[PDB]
Design brief:
Alpha-Beta Plaits, 40% strand, binds protoporphyrin IX containing FE, heme, ABM domain-containing protein, Heme-degrading_MO, iron, ABM_dom
């Protein structure tokens, strides 16, 4: 239900994973830094996590080769609409090849939601992005502009 995320250099972030083998913590390397994603039903184990309620979920988190995060700033009153602009999501992404999982993460310490989709490869995402099922989700209340970050399985 709950996702915790912390960012930084990957060698360091590994020492955190090895401390909590009991917990399902994914590590991927992005441009600016590496990320730890931690899906659990209870407690964080990061110092200073970014914390999220999972409000939509598909597939499981277990070793994706590629991860894409869309980082969206929603105003405080904006949330209820946005929230149910995603309920409205068709989830045409899920019935697509290479797609391992999606999570729509409601933030608890910021205004920035995160739509996290997990893939087997970059190309799997790169495929879907050019597909029509990208443009039936985008055809024809935000604090500041959204951005996308991307991460690779560990190198
Ligand atoms: C690489 C870029 C993006 C990806 C991968 C992405 C992914 C998604 C997905 C998977 C859904 C809904 C699930 C579905 O219909 O299959 C969705 C919906 C949405 N996205 Fe994005 N998105 C992107 C860019 C953006 C941008 C730039 C904005 C706003 C400026 C945005 C705002 C929304 C909103 C409001 C919805 C809910 C309406 C809908 O169902 O399409 N997204 N996005």
């Amino acid at each position: 239900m709950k996702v915790y995320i912390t960012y930084g250099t990957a060698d360091f972030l590994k020492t955190i994973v090895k401390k909590h083998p009991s917990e399902n913590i994914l590590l991927m390397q992005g441009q600016e830094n590496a990320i730890l994603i931690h899906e659990t039903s209870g407690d964080t184990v990061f110092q200073a996590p970014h914390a999220y309620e999972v409000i939509d979920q598909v597939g499981e988190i277990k070793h994706p080769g590629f991860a894409v995060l869309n980082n969206i700033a929603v105003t405080q009153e904006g949330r209820p609409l946005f929230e149910n602009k995603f309920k409205n999501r068709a989830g045409k992404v899920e019935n697509e090849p290479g797609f391992e999982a999606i999570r729509v993460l409601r933030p608890l310490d910021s205004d920035t939601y995160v739509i996290l989709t997990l893939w087997e490869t970059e190309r799997a995402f790169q495929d879907w992005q050019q597909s029509d099922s990208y443009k039936e989700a985008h055809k024809k209340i935000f604090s500041r502009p959204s951005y996308v970050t991307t991460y690779f399985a560990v190198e």
